[PDB]
Design a protein around this nucleic acid. Structure first.
Lengths: 110, 48, 89, 120, 43
RNA sequence: CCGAUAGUGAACCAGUACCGUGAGGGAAAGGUGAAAAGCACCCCGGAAGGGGAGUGAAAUAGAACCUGAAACCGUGUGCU
RNA sequence: GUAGCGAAAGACGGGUGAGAAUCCCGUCCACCGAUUGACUAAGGUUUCCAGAGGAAGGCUCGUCCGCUCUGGGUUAGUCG
């Protein structure tokens, strides 16, 4: 039923992206893809790329009925942050975060 | 002019309630085109 | 003598631009001079030269994956001969 | 009026070179407000070219620029020549408008609610 | 503005330097210490 | 007698990176598998990442790789 | 998702490419103007150039880079 795909350690915060992903939680691909091509952040095209491969999986492998596919679930969690600096004449620091993204997509059934 | 106490996560998420984002209208194009939004020229098969 | 000193000949774009003319290139021992160089090759190859220049070079630095270092210095050298030529490849 | 956040002399120069290029193209992609406010300018301007007088010629030459389209067949002429000899003829009727404009989507670099402008 | 350390190679090598600190006993004391520490570097 | 915040400063790239005009100070950094047998081939993706497939006793054993705690961050959920 | 994102007029088109405010070509405009100009010294030490590259870096971006990889590159009797 469920296909799945996952983005590994992506250079965005979950605080950055939880919002964009808190919309499609319980929807269809069609509306969802449209929304991704519609609204304007940098999360969008990536998430879209993800789903296109997710359904490449679901169809090439499991061969299910696309339009009847709804969002099963999808979210993300933290990842391996890195660290950088600010010159300033004396020391100063910062941290660059990442993200672990998951989408599971079902034909809404078993 | 800096924090006295710590931010309870309660209070955090409680403030972040209206920290959201809404969507576009997203109708069909019956004047001309595919599913394309209310009176909308072609971004993908649109009319108005 | 005379053959330890020239370690190899050099080849690149600029080299071939020079071999267009009688200007040829080598990389030789680093402790030498134009004169002994000339005295060596003019009799090794049985030829004679009009002139010569030299440059030197520092080690271009280098790195291979948590292990690094340098090159060696290079006594790059050039000769601008006058008659005959060289059956090189 | 509208300020743009840019400065006044910068702004005048901007608008005039903008309109110039637009004559060269008949349409162009840019932001919204910059087009919103070249709009009325060049409506006044085509209004001038609708009259062909030497005075209007002069008033145009204030705003327009010292430019040469490589016109077709390797030919050449100015925004001036074009305006006063290729266009006012065309819109010789019309009683307003003379342009149209095209809302589009945002841009990448920003949330730039961009627009194409066209000619009518 | 002006801060410290307007370098000269030569002057560095001169208050430092091998031929320098091999002059004096109180100089030559330390090169041992660098070697008795096995610090890899001298002057 | 200690078993990687120990044990010597150093079980690895150690008097090293690094700092210091200068003497001088001075780190961090161990664990795939029995066997690399280290994911053939397809699908998506600009790729990276993946899902399958396939390996292996095992891949929540996939190279940063033994387990994998807690803080922390998330998703669901029953009562609210 | 706060504060902040360091000094110098940009605009359009064309191109580029998976992808362009930030790369390229162009037209105009604008600024320095005893100089943000050119020279030499020290000092810096290959940042140079020809390609190839996104991974990391670049205070946004990134098809670009003083980032990386590869390969090349500094010629003296008079100059010093």
């Amino acid at each position: 039923m469920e296909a799945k795909a996952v983005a590994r350690t992506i250079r965005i915060a979950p605080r950055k992206v939880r919002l964009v992903l808190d919309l499609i939680r319980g929807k269809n691909a069609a509306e969802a893809i449209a929304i991704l091509k519609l609204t304007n952040k940098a999360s969008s095209p990536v998430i879209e790329k993800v789903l296109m491969s997710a359904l490449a999986n679901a169809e090439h492998n499991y061969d299910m009925n696309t339009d009847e596919l709804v969002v099963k679930e999808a979210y993300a969690n933290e990842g391996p942050t890195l660290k950088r600096f600010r010159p300033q004449g004396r020391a100063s620091a910062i941290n660059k975060r990442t993200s672990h993204i998951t989408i599971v997509v079902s034909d809404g059934k078993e | 002019a800096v924090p006295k106490r710590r931010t309870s996560k309660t209070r955090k998420n409680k403030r972040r309630t209206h920290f959201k984002i809404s969507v576009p209208g997203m109708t069909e194009c019956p004047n001309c085109g595919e599913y394309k939004l209310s009176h909308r020229v072609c971004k993908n098969c649109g009319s108005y | 003598e005379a053959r330890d000193i020239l370690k190899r000949p050099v080849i690149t774009e600029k080299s071939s631009e020079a071999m267009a003319e009688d200007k040829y290139t080598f990389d030789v021992d680093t402790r030498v001079n134009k004169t002994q160089v000339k005295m060596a090759v003019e009799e090794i190859f049985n030829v004679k030269v009009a002139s010569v220049n030299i440059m030197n070079y520092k080690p271009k630095k280098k790195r291979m994956g948590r292990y690094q270092g340098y090159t060696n210095k290079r006594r790059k050298a050039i000769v601008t001969l006058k008659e005959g030529s060289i059956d090189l490849f | 009026y509208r300020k743009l956040g840019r400065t006044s002399d910068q702004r005048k120069a901007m608008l005039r070179d903008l309109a110039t290029s637009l004559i060269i193209s008949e349409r162009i992609e840019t932001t919204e407000a910059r087009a919103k406010e070249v709009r009325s300018v060049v409506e006044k301007l085509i209004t001038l070219g609708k009259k062909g007088d030497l005075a209007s010629r002069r008033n145009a030459a204030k705003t327009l620029r010292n430019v040469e389209i490589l016109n077709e067949d390797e030919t050449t002429q100015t925004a001036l020549q074009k305006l006063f000899g290729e266009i006012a003829e065309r819109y010789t009727e019309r009683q307003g408008g003379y342009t149209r404009i095209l809302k589009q989507g945002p841009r990448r670099g920003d949330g730039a609610e961009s627009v194409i402008i066209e000619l009518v | 503005v002006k801060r410290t350390y307007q370098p000269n190679k030569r002057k560095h090598s001169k208050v430092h330097g091998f031929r320098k600190r091999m002059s004096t006993k109180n100089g030559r004391k330390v090169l041992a210490r660098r070697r008795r520490k096995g610090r890899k570097v001298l002057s």
